[PDB]
Design a binder for this molecule. Sequence first.
Ligand SMILES: Nc1ncnc2c1ncn2[C@@H]1O[C@H](COP(=O)(O)OP(=O)(O)O)[C@@H](O)[C@H]1O
Ligand SMILES: Nc1ncnc2c1ncn2[C@@H]1O[C@H](COP(=O)(O)OP(=O)(O)O)[C@@H](O)[C@H]1O
Ligand SMILES: Nc1ncnc2c1ncn2[C@@H]1O[C@H](COP(=O)(O)OP(=O)(O)O)[C@@H](O)[C@H]1O
Ligand SMILES: [Zn+2]
Ligand SMILES: [Zn+2]
Ligand SMILES: [Zn+2]
Ligand SMILES: [Zn+2]
Lengths: 423, 425, 425, 423
Amino acid sequence: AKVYIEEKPKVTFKDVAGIEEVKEEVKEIIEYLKDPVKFQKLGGRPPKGVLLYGEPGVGKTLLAKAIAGEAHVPFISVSGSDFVEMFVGVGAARVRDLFETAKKHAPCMIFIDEIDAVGRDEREQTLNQLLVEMDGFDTSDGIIVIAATNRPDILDPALLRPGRFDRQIFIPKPDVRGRYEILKVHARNKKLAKDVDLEFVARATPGLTGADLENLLNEAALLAARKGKEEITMEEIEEALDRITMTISPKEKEKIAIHEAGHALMGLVSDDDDKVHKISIIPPIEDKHIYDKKDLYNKILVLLGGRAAEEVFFGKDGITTGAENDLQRATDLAYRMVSMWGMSDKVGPIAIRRDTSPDLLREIDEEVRRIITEQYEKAKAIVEEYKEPLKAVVKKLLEKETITCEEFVEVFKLYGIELKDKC
Amino acid sequence: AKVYIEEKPKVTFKDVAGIEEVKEEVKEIIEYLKDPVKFQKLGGRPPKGVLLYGEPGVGKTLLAKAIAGEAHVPFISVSGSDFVEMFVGVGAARVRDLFETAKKHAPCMIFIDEIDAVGRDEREQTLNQLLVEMDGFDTSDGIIVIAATNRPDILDPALLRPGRFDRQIFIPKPDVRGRYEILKVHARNKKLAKDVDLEFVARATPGLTGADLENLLNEAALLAARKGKEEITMEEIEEALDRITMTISPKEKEKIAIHEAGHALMGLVSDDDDKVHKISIIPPIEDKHIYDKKDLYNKILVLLGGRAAEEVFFGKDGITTGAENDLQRATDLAYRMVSMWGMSDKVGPIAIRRDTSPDLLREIDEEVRRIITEQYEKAKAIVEEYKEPLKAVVKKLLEKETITCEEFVEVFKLYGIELKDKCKK
Amino acid sequence: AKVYIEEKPKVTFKDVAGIEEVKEEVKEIIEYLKDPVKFQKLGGRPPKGVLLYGEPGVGKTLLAKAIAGEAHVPFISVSGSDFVEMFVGVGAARVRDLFETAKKHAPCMIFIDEIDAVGRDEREQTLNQLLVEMDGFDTSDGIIVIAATNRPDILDPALLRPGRFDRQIFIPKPDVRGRYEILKVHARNKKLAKDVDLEFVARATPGLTGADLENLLNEAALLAARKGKEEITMEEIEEALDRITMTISPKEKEKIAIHEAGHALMGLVSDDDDKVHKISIIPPIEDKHIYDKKDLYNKILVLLGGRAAEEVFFGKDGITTGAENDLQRATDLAYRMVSMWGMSDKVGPIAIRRDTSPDLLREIDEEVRRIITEQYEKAKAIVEEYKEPLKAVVKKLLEKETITCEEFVEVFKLYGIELKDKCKK
Amino acid sequence: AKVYIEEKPKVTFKDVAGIEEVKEEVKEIIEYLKDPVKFQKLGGRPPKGVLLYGEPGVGKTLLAKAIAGEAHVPFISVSGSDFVEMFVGVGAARVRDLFETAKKHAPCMIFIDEIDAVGRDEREQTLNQLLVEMDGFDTSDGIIVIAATNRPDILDPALLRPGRFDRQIFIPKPDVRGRYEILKVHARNKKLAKDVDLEFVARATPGLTGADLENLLNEAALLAARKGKEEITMEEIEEALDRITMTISPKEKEKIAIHEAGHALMGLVSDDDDKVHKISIIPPIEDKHIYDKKDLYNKILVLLGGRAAEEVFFGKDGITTGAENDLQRATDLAYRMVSMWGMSDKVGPIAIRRDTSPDLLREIDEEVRRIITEQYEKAKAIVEEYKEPLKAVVKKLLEKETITCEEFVEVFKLYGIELKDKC
Ligand SMILES: Nc1ncnc2c1ncn2[C@@H]1O[C@H](COP(=O)(O)OP(=O)(O)O)[C@@H](O)[C@H]1O
Ligand SMILES: Nc1ncnc2c1ncn2[C@@H]1O[C@H](COP(=O)(O)OP(=O)(O)O)[C@@H](O)[C@H]1O
Ligand SMILES: Nc1ncnc2c1ncn2[C@@H]1O[C@H](COP(=O)(O)OP(=O)(O)O)[C@@H](O)[C@H]1O
Ligand SMILES: [Zn+2]
Ligand SMILES: [Zn+2]
Ligand SMILES: [Zn+2]
Ligand SMILES: [Zn+2]
């Protein structure tokens, strides 16, 4: 209940590296905090709140410090685990004074990490106060709020409606080039040897954040100060790596890559789809859109891809618990197809209101097995057909850790195959 | 809780366009706020509350501003997300002072948008206060209240009884002629080029409101002020259209039209049914009444129409998730027919009230499938027979976006098909 | 909470018309409020409360005003939607002062409409206070209370025990002769033309109250004052009739009449039963007693009558959703017969009380279908046998809208058919 | 919250008539209130509370007035619908002052009718106070409490434990000789004609109390004062009888008698039983006792009696809804026999814990039908065998309305049949 800062940061876009795509979506806020009078006189409207969700230590705080730093504007930073009811509470009266001090020091930026504890009675009185405080203040104030979290699924859905945090940005765990740039950000301060290679350190860290990697480069100098050395060598670097041993094994990495390449392939091959994106080893579909039967079969096909890719590559005994949600998602889509949208000829256009006769349930299930197995046999076949260019995609994927959409189809072009422009 | 405005509006029936049918039902309120002493001395009774429900940004606020504006009467406005309990509360004492200030500034109009948050037990004590405040004041006060919402299904049913909001008006998302008139309202202020066409902008905006369309015409001048131009050209207009890409694709528009024309045809053809209304692409069936077996089959037939129209036009692989509620509604009607109203010869006049033997459940289901498939085969056949007049409807429907029942019937007349006078007035 | 009247009414039995049977049961209260000293010195006991339940606007308030008016005694009136808890409450202390002011102005009458909102724990504290306030005061006080409602099913069952409202009177929606007499009460004040006929207005209003009818005759003079006429003609009368369009269609009226005639026939024909009452087109089983198997079959037979009458008259496609409760009630009686009272030879004298094997459930259901279909085939056969005198009843019933049991019997006697003496007295 | 009396009654055992068996169980209280010093010096212990339960108007108040009247001791009478919470409440402080005033006016009697409303939170604070107030006071105080009710099933079970109302007495609706004596109690005050017969009035009143019969003899004099007569004749007596038209029809009376004679016969005939009592037309079995298989079959047999008697006398179409509880009770006993006590050879000594396989449920049910039908066929047969003496018992039963145990077996003796001394 006492953590918020008000500093003019020294940490800009130089201290942050690896999340270049995330950097391109925060530049419109940088141009806004620099000159809000340029945004006010024109007639535009900025986001009243920008969300920074992801795994613990992905660089949530550092991104918020870079936006205020690059724009030469103040930075405020408090925690959400601070506001806890201890003798009823004045949790709501707090929020009222945040925007009042922001208008006194306008333009400026505000930040609140782990706001999922206060925002999950008295708890809703403080939560609803923050909602009104966002809808009240306008563009003329020249201030913006950023609220981070460790879990996005446990925050209140009302803290996501327009005017009450409408922009959503995801900060992912760093890849090979993502970690190599992090290992160059912290290395500017510390003294490193001539025999040290940052590329092997970046390669041998799957399932490790930018913050958990900072713990490794700080303990390497700590072990160099304990032993007695003026240069951080490979011996103390590899020692801190054993403190960590969680992490993705190289065998698992292969399984993940093949699974991920399955989905990707499936989409870049089916009749008509809804955009293929970046393929990375670093770990519902109905919306307000209207779909036909052909569309949903392909939705199921993609969902089944990775498992089929696993089955094709490692065999029946090789399939993993990775396809857990994909299997579920696919089946559920298939039950909605049969029992809800009447897309089963055997079951007819009847719609089961989810007292249903056992025979009808049988018919529904039997048809859902028919759809799933049918599409699964179809996915397996496509992987079987494109095994060799996939093998290659997977090698590229294991080294880079993340491959965008383009190059995959180009790797397929190398194997004389034309897919479809679905990036 | 603390938003309330009492302005003499400058925005009248000139600033609102596209909802001409909605405009005809609010003119009796315009003649009432102008001279209430004419309505008092005669002996008539006005609505104590008029509902303005629809999608977010359909022009709920602007319609309420036009009624007060055209009648030259004040306009009060506040939000329903304001009155939230913060240490028990004094939310009821508020409502008491609304009608008191209204009688001091009589005649005048009152408006409250998103009243679904306050009206969804402290919450019920503020809710019940508003109910009494409506039944208390009479015609002599010369004041009316209008309460808007983003969802009509989440408001309290007591806020719909006579004397406590008895009038219901729906504001729909604008069509082609509805958006073209909206594209002429916000263009009076801004400077437009000679090469710009508002008809193509209106045609390329399916699933877009009047408020989401002003966001497009305001960003087009913003992009013209950023680049450096004195005239808003087609280049910056089409650019703001890419910022939007929750819209209906042209292929989807066809699917929607065929589905919607299915329902209409079904209804306009059914032996006996009751009323067919405006057909449009822009996206419990009993009442008190008494229906016979023949009636309910036709009710199911209509419900199945659109899907059958989809199946006939696009094929088995072409049927969409659009028929979701129709399919459900139809099945439920068929179960009520079998298990509740004893309209199944095989099942008899027995009536199931949920301990029911597995065999009987089987029999019930098997008959429900028999009725649904039977009627569905019937709908498909009706569509098949009138494919050509239906394609002609679909054509009109895609261009105008909304057609009337009379317009539908006229197209059929042209093909030499006389349909039942099931048209609403 | 704050409505309470105490006027000496001008409205007597002259202003109330159509409910003549309801008027005969309120005359003992008229003779009581006129001279209570005649009722006290003799030794008799009057009802401490008389219930006035029915549809909204059946003439609940007007009946209570006629009893006080005819007896030349004061009339107190208040609403039940007034007493709502707002900061805990002092709702019980109110009821205490009602009977105290009644003893000061003795003899007098008290009335409370919509008492179903206050009487549906603070809510129970005010409710229980009213219960004690009834048991406390006696015949010597010379006062009587009348509490009306819009729904009888939502009031507390304790407000129906002896000493706490023991008398129950139902005010029904007016019929043809009922509405014609209503049309003559509200016409004494207004000026009517020579070409106007009140009999056609009385005939073309099915499913319309005495109050919803007053809305029609008041708007007819309103349209005559708007247009500019000194006499209310047929043109403005028929115009106000289009403002109304949840009425009963003439086709529906026939279906209702036939259904209603089925139930009556079934009754007046069955071996032995428990009386047949007024048959009317104007739109939870048994007591302790002790019944035999033969009686319950006949109870089911009557329940099935109307549906059988529908099937016989309109055919299989013609059966309506009207038989919904009958069908249910009949089936439930049949399950109680089989699974509870061991009246099924196939199932034996075992008594199921819900872990029952699937086979036994099957046996139970199969027997219930056997009973229902058996009795239904029996009802259909009776309606078929008596289709002719029944068509006659239906005819009388459509014109009069309501016929007595005796009127039915009579119609049958004409076709030389003796029925059982099962009419109520 | 203001109803209790403190009178020296004038109404004794002369004003009460028909409930002579109930009169014999209240005489030990009469000898106690007369001289409690005789009961205290000897060493005996009287009941701290005596229950008076039955139908509304059976003569609950009048019995309590007769005990205080015959013993020449005061009588206190309040209602249980008086103590209702209106602004929290001082319901408990009341009970404390009842026994204090009782010790000041010792010896005396206390009475509370409809105590089921106060005794069904704050409600339990007043209820528990009455419990302690009973256990506290002893024999030396020379006072006794009597609490009546309209329903015995809705009062608290704690108001039935020893020291807290241990004595239970049932006051039944009057019979023919029961009503004839009531019609002679109220007739002492009023003037009756020479052509009037009280025996026909007593015969034509089935399902009518002593209080509901007082309403008839008071309205007969009211109709005699309205018309203008000095003597209450048969014309005004029969008129008040039409105000009543609830009542048992003569056809129903026959059905009831036959049913009741069924049970009676069954018990007076089966292998070994647990006492047959008075047979009257006026409308679980496991306890802390151990039963064998033979015993429970006979328990079921009796339970099925009346229905079998109905079936034998009126036929299959003639069976009534009267056997409702008997049928249920019998079946439940049969399920406990099969599924709980393992008394079914087909089902074995397994005990179903009331996830039970459908087949086993079938087996259980099939055996319960086997027991019920078997015993039912047995009951029907016994009625069939003793139809003629039963016919007679039923005639005797219709005229007297209540026949004790003895005479039934004597009526059977008249038809040369010997039953067993089970009275
Ligand atoms: N992507 C990154 N690039 C550079 N440094 C990083 C990155 N992510 C984390 N760090 C460093 O890790 C440390 C702690 O991480 P932090 O930003 O607080 O993580 P989070 O806010 O997600 O919990 C900081 O010193 C920060 O510089
Ligand atoms: N049966 C009737 N006969 C005559 N007038 C009637 C009748 N029923 C209703 N009205 C008239 O309708 C008006 C309002 O009806 P009201 O008595 O208040 O209905 P309710 O009390 O059932 O809600 C009154 O002016 C009353 O005279
Ligand atoms: N068994 C009876 N014998 C004589 N009089 C009776 C009998 N039962 C009731 N009464 C009379 O009926 C009247 C009211 O009955 P009451 O004793 O108050 O019934 P309860 O207490 O069961 O409600 C009294 O005047 C009483 O004398
Ligand atoms: Zn996957
Ligand atoms: Zn549809
Ligand atoms: Zn019916
Ligand atoms: Zn019995």
